[PDB]
Design an enzyme around this catalytic site. Sequence first.
Site, PDB file in Angstrom:
ATOM      1  N   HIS A 202      22.338   1.949 -43.491  1.00  0.00           N
ATOM      2  CA  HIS A 202      23.739   2.353 -43.587  1.00  0.00           C
ATOM      3  C   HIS A 202      24.251   2.570 -44.998  1.00  0.00           C
ATOM      4  CE1 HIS A 202      24.674   0.711 -39.287  1.00  0.00           C
ATOM      5  NE2 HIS A 202      23.851   1.746 -39.292  1.00  0.00           N
ATOM      6  N   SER A 206      21.819   8.478 -42.377  1.00  0.00           N
ATOM      7  CA  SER A 206      20.583   9.130 -41.980  1.00  0.00           C
ATOM      8  C   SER A 206      20.212  10.362 -42.770  1.00  0.00           C
ATOM      9  CB  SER A 206      20.633   9.518 -40.518  1.00  0.00           C
ATOM     10  OG  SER A 206      20.785   8.369 -39.715  1.00  0.00           O
ATOM     11  N   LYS A 228      23.062  11.367 -26.660  1.00  0.00           N
ATOM     12  CA  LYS A 228      21.732  11.878 -26.962  1.00  0.00           C
ATOM     13  C   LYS A 228      20.700  10.752 -26.840  1.00  0.00           C
ATOM     14  CE  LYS A 228      19.230  14.445 -30.594  1.00  0.00           C
ATOM     15  NZ  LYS A 228      18.832  15.617 -29.757  1.00  0.00           N
ATOM     16  N   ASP A 229      21.033   9.581 -27.364  1.00  0.00           N
ATOM     17  CA  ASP A 229      20.115   8.460 -27.285  1.00  0.00           C
ATOM     18  C   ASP A 229      19.938   7.928 -25.858  1.00  0.00           C
ATOM     19  OD1 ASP A 229      20.712   6.873 -30.566  1.00  0.00           O
ATOM     20  OD2 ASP A 229      19.949   8.859 -29.966  1.00  0.00           O
ATOM     21  N   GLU A 272      -6.520  -3.173 -27.928  1.00  0.00           N
ATOM     22  CA  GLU A 272      -5.639  -2.343 -27.130  1.00  0.00           C
ATOM     23  C   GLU A 272      -5.551  -1.014 -27.864  1.00  0.00           C
ATOM     24  OE1 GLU A 272      -3.598  -2.914 -24.108  1.00  0.00           O
ATOM     25  OE2 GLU A 272      -5.408  -4.169 -23.987  1.00  0.00           O
TER      26      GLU A 272
HETATM   27  C1  HEM Z   1      11.060  -3.005 -34.473  1.00  0.00           C
HETATM   28  C2  HEM Z   1      11.011  -1.696 -35.301  1.00  0.00           C
HETATM   29  C3  HEM Z   1      12.037  -0.926 -35.843  1.00  0.00           C
HETATM   30  C4  HEM Z   1      13.350  -0.792 -35.403  1.00  0.00           C
HETATM   31  C5  HEM Z   1      14.068  -1.535 -34.267  1.00  0.00           C
HETATM   32  C6  HEM Z   1      13.867   0.361 -36.160  1.00  0.00           C
HETATM   33  C7  HEM Z   1      15.107   0.890 -35.965  1.00  0.00           C
HETATM   34  C8  HEM Z   1      15.631   1.939 -36.667  1.00  0.00           C
HETATM   35  C9  HEM Z   1      16.871   2.585 -36.329  1.00  0.00           C
HETATM   36  C10 HEM Z   1      17.773   2.310 -35.131  1.00  0.00           C
HETATM   37  C11 HEM Z   1      17.071   3.594 -37.213  1.00  0.00           C
HETATM   38  C12 HEM Z   1      18.169   4.666 -37.072  1.00  0.00           C
HETATM   39  C13 HEM Z   1      17.813   5.757 -36.046  1.00  0.00           C
HETATM   40  C14 HEM Z   1      16.608   6.615 -36.460  1.00  0.00           C
HETATM   41  O1  HEM Z   1      16.662   7.261 -37.526  1.00  0.00           O
HETATM   42  O2  HEM Z   1      15.603   6.651 -35.726  1.00  0.00           O
HETATM   43  C15 HEM Z   1      15.918   3.520 -38.094  1.00  0.00           C
HETATM   44  C16 HEM Z   1      15.722   4.357 -39.152  1.00  0.00           C
HETATM   45  C17 HEM Z   1      14.656   4.322 -40.053  1.00  0.00           C
HETATM   46  N1  HEM Z   1      13.593   3.452 -39.917  1.00  0.00           N
HETATM   47 FE1  HEM Z   1      13.244   2.165 -38.480  1.00  0.00          FE
HETATM   48  N2  HEM Z   1      12.955   0.853 -37.123  1.00  0.00           N
HETATM   49  C18 HEM Z   1      11.828   0.104 -36.914  1.00  0.00           C
HETATM   50  C19 HEM Z   1      10.682   0.271 -37.630  1.00  0.00           C
HETATM   51  C20 HEM Z   1      10.508   1.081 -38.703  1.00  0.00           C
HETATM   52  C21 HEM Z   1       9.223   1.356 -39.351  1.00  0.00           C
HETATM   53  C22 HEM Z   1       7.850   0.794 -39.005  1.00  0.00           C
HETATM   54  C23 HEM Z   1       9.444   2.233 -40.348  1.00  0.00           C
HETATM   55  C24 HEM Z   1       8.514   2.778 -41.229  1.00  0.00           C
HETATM   56  C25 HEM Z   1       7.448   2.004 -41.860  1.00  0.00           C
HETATM   57  C26 HEM Z   1      10.876   2.485 -40.291  1.00  0.00           C
HETATM   58  C27 HEM Z   1      11.497   3.378 -41.133  1.00  0.00           C
HETATM   59  C28 HEM Z   1      12.773   3.813 -40.982  1.00  0.00           C
HETATM   60  C29 HEM Z   1      13.408   4.733 -41.906  1.00  0.00           C
HETATM   61  C30 HEM Z   1      12.852   5.187 -43.286  1.00  0.00           C
HETATM   62  C31 HEM Z   1      14.567   5.133 -41.278  1.00  0.00           C
HETATM   63  C32 HEM Z   1      15.422   6.283 -41.765  1.00  0.00           C
HETATM   64  C33 HEM Z   1      15.475   7.443 -40.782  1.00  0.00           C
HETATM   65  C34 HEM Z   1      16.020   8.739 -41.396  1.00  0.00           C
HETATM   66  O3  HEM Z   1      15.256   9.455 -42.086  1.00  0.00           O
HETATM   67  O4  HEM Z   1      17.223   9.042 -41.194  1.00  0.00           O
HETATM   68  N3  HEM Z   1      11.491   1.843 -39.221  1.00  0.00           N
HETATM   69  N4  HEM Z   1      14.998   2.573 -37.709  1.00  0.00           N
HETATM   70  C1  LIG Z   2      -6.261 -11.626 -29.775  1.00  0.00           C
HETATM   71  O1  LIG Z   2      -6.808 -10.339 -29.811  1.00  0.00           O
HETATM   72  C2  LIG Z   2      -5.805  -9.432 -29.524  1.00  0.00           C
HETATM   73  C3  LIG Z   2      -6.273  -8.006 -29.498  1.00  0.00           C
HETATM   74  C4  LIG Z   2      -5.386  -7.060 -29.222  1.00  0.00           C
HETATM   75  O2  LIG Z   2      -5.723  -5.868 -29.178  1.00  0.00           O
HETATM   76  O3  LIG Z   2      -3.996  -7.427 -28.967  1.00  0.00           O
HETATM   77  C5  LIG Z   2      -3.029  -6.419 -28.668  1.00  0.00           C
HETATM   78  C6  LIG Z   2      -7.719  -7.662 -29.771  1.00  0.00           C
HETATM   79  C7  LIG Z   2      -8.639  -7.499 -28.695  1.00  0.00           C
HETATM   80  C8  LIG Z   2     -10.009  -7.169 -28.958  1.00  0.00           C
HETATM   81  C9  LIG Z   2     -10.489  -6.996 -30.289  1.00  0.00           C
HETATM   82  C10 LIG Z   2      -9.616  -7.151 -31.386  1.00  0.00           C
HETATM   83  C11 LIG Z   2      -8.221  -7.485 -31.174  1.00  0.00           C
HETATM   84  O4  LIG Z   2      -7.354  -7.651 -32.230  1.00  0.00           O
HETATM   85  C12 LIG Z   2      -7.137  -6.730 -33.231  1.00  0.00           C
HETATM   86  C13 LIG Z   2      -6.240  -7.073 -34.248  1.00  0.00           C
HETATM   87  C14 LIG Z   2      -6.039  -6.134 -35.263  1.00  0.00           C
HETATM   88  O5  LIG Z   2      -5.171  -6.467 -36.258  1.00  0.00           O
HETATM   89  C15 LIG Z   2      -4.850  -5.662 -37.331  1.00  0.00           C
HETATM   90  C16 LIG Z   2      -4.240  -4.361 -37.155  1.00  0.00           C
HETATM   91  C17 LIG Z   2      -3.922  -3.578 -38.302  1.00  0.00           C
HETATM   92  C18 LIG Z   2      -4.200  -4.073 -39.625  1.00  0.00           C
HETATM   93  C19 LIG Z   2      -4.806  -5.362 -39.851  1.00  0.00           C
HETATM   94  C20 LIG Z   2      -5.140  -6.171 -38.732  1.00  0.00           C
HETATM   95  C21 LIG Z   2      -5.744  -7.455 -38.926  1.00  0.00           C
HETATM   96  N1  LIG Z   2      -6.260  -8.468 -39.055  1.00  0.00           N
HETATM   97  N2  LIG Z   2      -6.699  -4.931 -35.244  1.00  0.00           N
HETATM   98  C22 LIG Z   2      -7.560  -4.609 -34.260  1.00  0.00           C
HETATM   99  N3  LIG Z   2      -7.773  -5.510 -33.264  1.00  0.00           N
END
Ligand code: HEM
Ligand SMILES: CO/C=C(/C(=O)OC)c1ccccc1Oc1cc(Oc2ccccc2C#N)ncn1
Lengths: 380, 101, 80, 61, 109
Positions: A202, A206, A228-229, A272
Amino acid sequence: MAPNIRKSHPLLKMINNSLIDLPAPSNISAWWNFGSLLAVCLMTQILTGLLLAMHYTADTSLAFSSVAHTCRNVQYGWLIRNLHANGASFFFICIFLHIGRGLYYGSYLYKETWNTGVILLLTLMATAFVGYVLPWGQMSFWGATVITNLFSAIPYIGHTLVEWAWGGFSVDNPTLTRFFALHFLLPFAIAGITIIHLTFLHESGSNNPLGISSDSDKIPFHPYYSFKDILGLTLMLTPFLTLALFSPNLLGDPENFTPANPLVTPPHIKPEWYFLFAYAILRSIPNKLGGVLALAASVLILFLIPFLHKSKQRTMTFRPLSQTLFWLLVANLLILTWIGSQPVEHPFIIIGQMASLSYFTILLILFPTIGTLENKMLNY
Amino acid sequence: GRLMDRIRKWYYNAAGFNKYGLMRDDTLYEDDDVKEALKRLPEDLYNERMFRIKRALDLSLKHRILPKEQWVKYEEDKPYLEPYLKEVIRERLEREAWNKK
Amino acid sequence: IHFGNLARVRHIITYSLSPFEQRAIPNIFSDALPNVWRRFSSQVFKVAPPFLGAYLLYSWGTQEFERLKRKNPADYENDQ
Amino acid sequence: ALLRQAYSALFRRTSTFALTVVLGAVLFERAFDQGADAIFEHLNEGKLWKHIKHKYEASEE
Amino acid sequence: FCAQGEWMRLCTSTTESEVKRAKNHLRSAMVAQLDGTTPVCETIGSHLLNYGRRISLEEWDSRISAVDARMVRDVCSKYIYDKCPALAAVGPIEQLLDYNRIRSGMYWI
Ligand code: HEM
Ligand SMILES: CO/C=C(/C(=O)OC)c1ccccc1Oc1cc(Oc2ccccc2C#N)ncn1
Ligand code: HEM
């Protein structure tokens, strides 16, 4: 104080400045629907999670059956179990599309929002990892065993950190009970850090698909994006439920319908789908220590993206070379995912090392290089 | 010969911002230098840039582009900001250098 | 307060109709579909290629793997 | 004109709009369930216990 | 926000007190429009052209006096409640926004 109570009140004011009167770019696309889905996804996991937790028993001697009891006796226990297990995949699908979008549109230039995002991803992975152990099936135990042993390869403090984590000499009951505690806990940390994520977000508002300032054209979040969402919610929710109801085990390992047995290694210990790509990178480096680092790096690499931006433009909308490089990367990840599900043999071994190698090359070398190149082709 | 020119004009059309009616400079990411540069633009240039952008965002939300006729032609793209931006960067590098000495 | 402090805008007029005076999904054939096609066309050769390439690699590698499982008659031609 | 009547009677006043949704739901559920269950059983003739039940239901030993 | 709010009050919760006063203000208004020859002449020219006859203050007053809370609410509801309005805005209007939001200010007091 003020005219309408939606602005004065110390709480509604917050709900208003983030879900109603909050200024949103008029041109954000469907790729911006994943944040809200991620949030809803989280509320749903926590919900179904608690409902399952109320019937679970964290003990090697009762885990497997407590889960079976839940499915077989609890009213709609089977449904909740399905929804929770399948919700984990919906969560990751949504997160990979959320991350993709940000990479393609340079959202990462919002450094703090980006870094808190990487933290959300790491926490989400740890959560799913420890959650996966709870049913205490064969892949539960062996996955836990394979992965946690990797760390005994860290120098000097290796065996120590691992045996500490296990609470003993192998993955056993004291590991299960602490994993349950962790699995119950982390999701709340995810909810907390998510608040921070949106708070940093915020600060700027965005980003949008053309990557140029949208101050000249902003619209209120409600009703435009609330609608939209919500629509985006049902569009995704359909494939989700279709899977959880018509093909409950499509994504699961049959090996997990067998109680964990320390004296019987499954033939193919694989994760997985959402971890496969990393598992592939893991096995690409023959050498316990290098593989672990390579694994760690496969995700930690995300913290470097903000520093490898060379383009003079924010998005890749108007950057054709970067666009193909982007889809190469995506294809690269499908290949790693596929390699991760295959045995460690020829030709999979070599293909694995190529895809692992090109994965890091593309993010560390090519992206910043092509970016600069494109700056020259714009006469900049 | 005219190689660099064939490439550029090619990338220019490959990029595609001209389909929104935007000038190359309209597409710049607004970092610190670009922001200062924009403050120096004459009112008319600034208001034109603003309309072009607002227009682009509206096309973008509509999932449309301009009719082929209205597309900015490679050779008619006015580099309205590059002059200011270069001076801003020149000034900045001077200070950075001087504050080091 | 984020509305009113955003940008300095001048001389732009905009015209809009209430949602009840217009259609929700207008000109599906004259405007919508054509554009959908336009959008698909403009991206296909940027997205498709690497995915096609991935597919090939997948097919080769899958077949090459099953092929190495079959037996080569040239290992038993003199096992009399 | 139903649309106009609907509008005037049901959708204009927010109070009646809510009443229409509630009463609408109560009626939709009743109908929707009966229908779906109806479809499910037809698509599964003679396979459900409901169907074969009579054979052991007070007609054996 | 406040303005549309007042319109909603008109349709849903007008008071006899309010109308009682609104009527007196209106009477004074009509009377004030006939303060001079030009304004009286303006009235005649118009009344004829629009009503096809003259409506005396005595009549206006008759009509105005028959108006009561209940009546104001019905008439207003009939012309304002849940209607798509026409809007014109000129100047530094960034803070005013979205037809949709305004259209929603058209219902529920
Ligand atoms: C439990 C996971 C997460 C939640 C609940 C979450 C939620 C949100 C929400 C609600 C927004 C605003 C809506 C949207 O732009 O989609 C947002 C934006 C954003 N999130 Fe996440 N996010 C998560 C994970 C991540 C991850 C893994 C990344 C990247 C490593 C990330 C990067 C961003 C960025 C950079 C924005 C800006 C979007 C734009 O360009 O306007 N978020 N996120
Ligand atoms: C307890 O094992 C859980 C597993 C799983 O897939 O849970 C969703 C699993 C099952 C079989 C073999 C390996 C498993 O666990 C995992 C865990 C794992 O963890 C990472 C993912 C991305 C980066 C680093 C790690 C680590 N450490 N990356 C790949 N396999
Ligand atoms: C970030 C949200 C969460 C994720 C990603 C998640 C993920 C998982 C996963 C991957 C499993 C194993 C699924 C399987 O059986 O194959 C699992 C199991 C479980 N989760 Fe969660 N979970 C989350 C939140 C919660 C929470 C908050 C609770 C409740 C406090 C919870 C309680 C459980 C229980 C009891 C199990 C074991 C029963 C079972 O296997 O179904 N989960 N979870």
